Amino acid sequence: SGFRKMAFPSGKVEGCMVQVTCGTTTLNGLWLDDVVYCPRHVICTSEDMLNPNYEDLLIRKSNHNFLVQAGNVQLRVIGHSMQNCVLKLKVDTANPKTPKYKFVRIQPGQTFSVLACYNGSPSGVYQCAMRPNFTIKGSFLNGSCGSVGFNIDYDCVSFCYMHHMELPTGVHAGTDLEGNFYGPFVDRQTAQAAGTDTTITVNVLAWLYAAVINGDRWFLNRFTTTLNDFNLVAMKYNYEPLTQDHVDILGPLSAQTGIAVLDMCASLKELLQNGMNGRTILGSALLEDEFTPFDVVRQCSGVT
Amino acid sequence: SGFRKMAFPSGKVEGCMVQVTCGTTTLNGLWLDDVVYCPRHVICTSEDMLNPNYEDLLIRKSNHNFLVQAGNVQLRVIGHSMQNCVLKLKVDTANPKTPKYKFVRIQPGQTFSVLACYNGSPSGVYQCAMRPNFTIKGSFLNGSCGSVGFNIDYDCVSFCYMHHMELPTGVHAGTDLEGNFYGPFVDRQTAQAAGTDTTITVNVLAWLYAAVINGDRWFLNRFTTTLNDFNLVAMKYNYEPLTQDHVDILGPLSAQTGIAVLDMCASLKELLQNGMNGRTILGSALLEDEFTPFDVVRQCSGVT
Ligand SMILES: O=C1[C@H](c2ccc(Cl)cc2)CCCN1c1cncc2ccccc12
Ligand SMILES: O=C1[C@H](c2ccc(Cl)cc2)CCCN1c1cncc2ccccc12
Numbered sequence: 001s002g003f004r005k006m007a008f009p010s011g012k013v014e015g016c017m018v019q020v021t022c023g024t025t026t027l028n029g030l031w032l033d034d035v036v037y038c039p040r041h042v043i044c045t046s047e048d049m050l051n052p053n054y055e056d057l058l059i060r061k062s063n064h065n066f067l068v069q070a071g072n073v074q075l076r077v078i079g080h081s082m083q084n085c086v087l088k089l090k091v092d093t094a095n096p097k098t099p100k101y102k103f104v105r106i107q108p109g110q111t112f113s114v115l116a117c118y119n120g121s122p123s124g125v126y127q128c129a130m131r132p133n134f135t136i137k138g139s140f141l142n143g144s145c146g147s148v149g150f151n152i153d154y155d156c157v158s159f160c161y162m163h164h165m166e167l168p169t170g171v172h173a174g175t176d177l178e179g180n181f182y183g184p185f186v187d188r189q190t191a192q193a194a195g196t197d198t199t200i201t202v203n204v205l206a207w208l209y210a211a212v213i214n215g216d217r218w219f220l221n222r223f224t225t226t227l228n229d230f231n232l233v234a235m236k237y238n239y240e241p242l243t244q245d246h247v248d249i250l251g252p253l254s255a256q257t258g259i260a261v262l263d264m265c266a267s268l269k270e271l272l273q274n275g276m277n278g279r280t281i282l283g284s285a286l287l288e289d290e291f292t293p294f295d296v297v298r299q300c301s302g303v304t
Numbered sequence: 305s306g307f308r309k310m311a312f313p314s315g316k317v318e319g320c321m322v323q324v325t326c327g328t329t330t331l332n333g334l335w336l337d338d339v340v341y342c343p344r345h346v347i348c349t350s351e352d353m354l355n356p357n358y359e360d361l362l363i364r365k366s367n368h369n370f371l372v373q374a375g376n377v378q379l380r381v382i383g384h385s386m387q388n389c390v391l392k393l394k395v396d397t398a399n400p401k402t403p404k405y406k407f408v409r410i411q412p413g414q415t416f417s418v419l420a421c422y423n424g425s426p427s428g429v430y431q432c433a434m435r436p437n438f439t440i441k442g443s444f445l446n447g448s449c450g451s452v453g454f455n456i457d458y459d460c461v462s463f464c465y466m467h468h469m470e471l472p473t474g475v476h477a478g479t480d481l482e483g484n485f486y487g488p489f490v491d492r493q494t495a496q497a498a499g500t501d502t503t504i505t506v507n508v509l510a511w512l513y514a515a516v517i518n519g520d521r522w523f524l525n526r527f528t529t530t531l532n533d534f535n536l537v538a539m540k541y542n543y544e545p546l547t548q549d550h551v552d553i554l555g556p557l558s559a560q561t562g563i564a565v566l567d568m569c570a571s572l573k574e575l576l577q578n579g580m581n582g583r584t585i586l587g588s589a590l591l592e593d594e595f596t597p598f599d600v601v602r603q604c605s606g607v608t
Contacts, residue, residue, distance in 0.1 A: 001470060002443040002470075002475070007429050009318050009428070011313075011315030011316075014313050116310070119608060123313070123602075123606060124310035124311065124313070125310065125313055126309060139306040139307055140305075143606060144606070170306060170518065171306070172306065280590065284590070285590040299443060300445070302446075302447060302448070
């Protein structure tokens, strides 16, 4: 028993972390096979950050201007290209530590582990979710650019995120491993609106099941609801509208606890309308939405 | 900016995780050099768990009865011994992935990362603290025994914890890497009292500094206090008595923010006496005590 904000073991990803220096700028890169992926803003300076013409800036850069360093060794850049907001530097050596990998673009509400890096060296690992407004509430400092978000399926690493920037609101924006930004964000130092951040209702419900599984049952009530009645309440409280897919995905948790999804929705409805009254659930005084039903199942079953 | 419950990168520890099977029992072991460390209760069955005479049980076991498996390969046990509540199985091969390491016994209030394992395979990593009552509020299922807690100092892994059991209260108890239990716990399936769990005051203050550093300043007030006045309030609210050592350890955080430690103590005093009033600090509705001042400095400076 016990429920924690667990992250995937980072070893497979640590073996992919390299330093990428272009001119006076240094950030993290991901070395998989003979390619190093990093944010394209490595070619920028702090002057041309207001309005960068990346095609123009990149034209003034050659293979030898990209200094890729893995631990202590220097990699030889034999090719370079821009793919959306990422640079792909082809190196003469394939990473001997390259795990089995996939580049996948995750959906909002989905969770992933982040390995925060500085100068190509890992420093921390934490779990987080792709917020419904496509931002991540991470922990990143100047130098963390190129740090990746990933998931692990036995031995296969699914890279889903690459960190690029911190918005003036303190939250973080970045791309999938093909250079496509999650959200409406552009890699420009300009005023960007993150948008309304709503609560991942299917995740709050999954975490409510995790609480029942681990003993915290106080919030459980004698009531029930319907998808439309529950949704009227979710809209007022800025909660993601719950669909029949969400109900189905909660099926295995509903089976483990014997609590119907709509009964759990009524318990949640009462927690939104009445608050916690000073009580906690899984050691938290607020409703947690950064655990997917897959995370709750995996953590409460012990998948390695 | 941004503040998260970060764990150390687990790669160095993943390379030490092995499976240890003794009879019908299977748990995790830590392979460093030619020794595998694991909880001694691997030699027990579910019958002799009420009152095990480990010296007697161990006498009936030989080197060949311990099946140590690293990934896919089977290690050859050429020696075995009991050191307090741990078994040290000497194997014929030194772990080629053994990092630079130390076995240190941490103090309550100190934090460490846990790599949760099942059948010698890592499944998750999370950060946690040694509670003042010597228990850990972890996330462990049947099979996680032998999972370790550690800290990393550049390239040196300080092993501080080995998981042994879950108490009937749902919290976890385990040993340092010399087999010595943290707390009054014995490796017996009997009613054990965890004790009163208090709040790590120096950690709540460090996290309050982290909040000011990251922008959340609402809790900051126009008042000040003294160590003795603050402590009267800490005692009523079951908070660890704050000493002059704690004040000194908060020195660098107090310097970064320009907020005197006793001024922050007055802000904390008001948060205890008046509650949060529905507000949050660093995205949390309760006072967080699982970040030491070293963690706040490391996370807000970017140490790799
Ligand atoms: O957001 C940025 C900056 C930026 C600006 C424009 C464009 Cl196009 C991309 C990136 C500079 C590089 C670092 N960076 C940061 C990324 N994460 C955490 C940060 C914490 C404090 C300070 C800067 C941080
Ligand atoms: O506490 C124990 C048991 C035990 C009993 C007596 C003695 Cl001497 C040691 C250990 C059996 C082995 C597994 N174990 C567990 C450890 N962590 C999480 C557990 C979650 C659910 C069930 C058991 C868990």
